[PDB]
Amino acid sequence: DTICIGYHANNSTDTVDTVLEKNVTVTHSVNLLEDSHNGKLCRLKGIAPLQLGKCNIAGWLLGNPECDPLLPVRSWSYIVETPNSENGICYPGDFIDYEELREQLSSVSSFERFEIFPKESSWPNHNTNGVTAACSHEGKSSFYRNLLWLTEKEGSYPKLKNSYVNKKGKEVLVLWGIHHPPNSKEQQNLYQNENAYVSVVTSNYNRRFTPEIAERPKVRDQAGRMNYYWTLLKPGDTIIFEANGNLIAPMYAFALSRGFGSGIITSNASMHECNTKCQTPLGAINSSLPYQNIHPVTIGECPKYVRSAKLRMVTGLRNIPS
């Protein structure tokens, strides 16, 4: 009569690595590395993202005519920019503090696009139908949907002066532009003033702009330049616009709501009827694993990104079924 002490074996072919030995076949093991995604853009915590389509952030905020207009009010969980965002700024120039504006948008969860200076009621003594071929729409010359190109009316450009009081209870993002003609002949033709200036003031913003006239290399067939500026108008505060020329005036502004967990990503993936807790530019992750090797850019509650190809922890024994 005999009794023997022994241990379990099975047909498992899982392998793990140790400090002393690689490629150890074990009876049971647990994978800790998430490598699977669904390849789709999904709602995050039940909230759909904001897709800008052919527009980048600059094109959407300025109102590039070649992008499908969005609904007046949108709410989102993250922002998607398509990799080949050909529609952005259409009239050449510099977007001052543009990267800072993107960082502000990354913590925004909603916008309301509203008319801050009505087109047919705010500029009675000025011309408001200025368009350019650099911002074409359907082959025709056009302009930004959210801005107004003011020019002289009846051979006169009176000193304009308009203000807005923020009664929305939320931050209002105001965008405007300054045009710099390539020669003094055009400056007199458009604005009738050579010593022109623009003044924009709030309780915490105070800047003055002056045209700088010079001939420049053509960009999108424009020797002129248009510099774009922005500021966040606090609840209850007033913004005052003062100019005798060169002002690309605001028409529409955005009332912004602040949220958490949002951001801006670049992806060519398509939106789908799905929900996830973790979104990457390549796809969504449905996993409770501590690590993932899919993408370093994540939205939501996600596994930690690592460079590893395999993270398998042994739970069972060394497998010796011989």
Partner: protein, 171 residues
């Protein structure tokens, strides 16, 4: 292994034992069969489950983390942001890979210890009433039925009951 049982003096495992990590195989006149040691297997299961949970628990949930943009005159800031992102990724990849490697080695030694301790428990109970025949097996110097076998699998083997008969057969 560190304790010499798994792939040691017990050369191989048992595919016939499906219900536990460690156990016994017996052979007497009533027949033979495998029997998993439920106490050591369940204790090991509780410890291993806790080890995996600890590994997952120590890793925090990764909340939203996206990139930033920089203009042509902010190269230094862009390189510093890249240096921060690269450095953190280096450490976490290093931390994760090492932790799995180190815990994997400890897990195998943990199972090796349990097999050895189980073997020593039986050896101390049987004393000179059986003989070590290698490969982690004992040959009894007396008849041991299913009731006698069960007294070995649990902690209640009666050494004085069989000492006289074992002494005669041991000769």
């Amino acid at each position: 292994g560190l304790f010499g049982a798994i792939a040691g003096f017990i050369e191989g495992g048992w595919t016939g034992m499906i219900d536990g990590w460690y156990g016994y195989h017996h052979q007497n006149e009533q027949g033979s069969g495998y029997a998993a040691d439920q106490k050591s297997t369940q204790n090991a299961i509780n410890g291993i489950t806790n080890k995996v949970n600890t590994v997952i628990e120590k890793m925090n949930i990764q909340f939203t983390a996206v990139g930033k943009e920089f203009n042509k005159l902010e190269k230094r800031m862009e390189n510093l942001n890249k240096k921060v992102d690269d450095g953190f990724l280096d450490i976490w990849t290093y931390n994760a890979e090492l932790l799995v490697l180190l815990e994997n080695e400890r897990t195998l030694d943990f199972h090796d210890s349990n097999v050895k301790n189980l073997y020593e428990k039986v050896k101390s109970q049987l004393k000179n009433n059986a003989k070590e025949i290698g490969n982690g097996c004992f040959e009894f110097y007396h008849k041991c039925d299913n009731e006698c076998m069960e007294s070995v699998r649990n902690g209640t083997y009666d050494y004085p009951k069989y000492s006289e008969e074992s002494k005669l057969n041991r000769e």
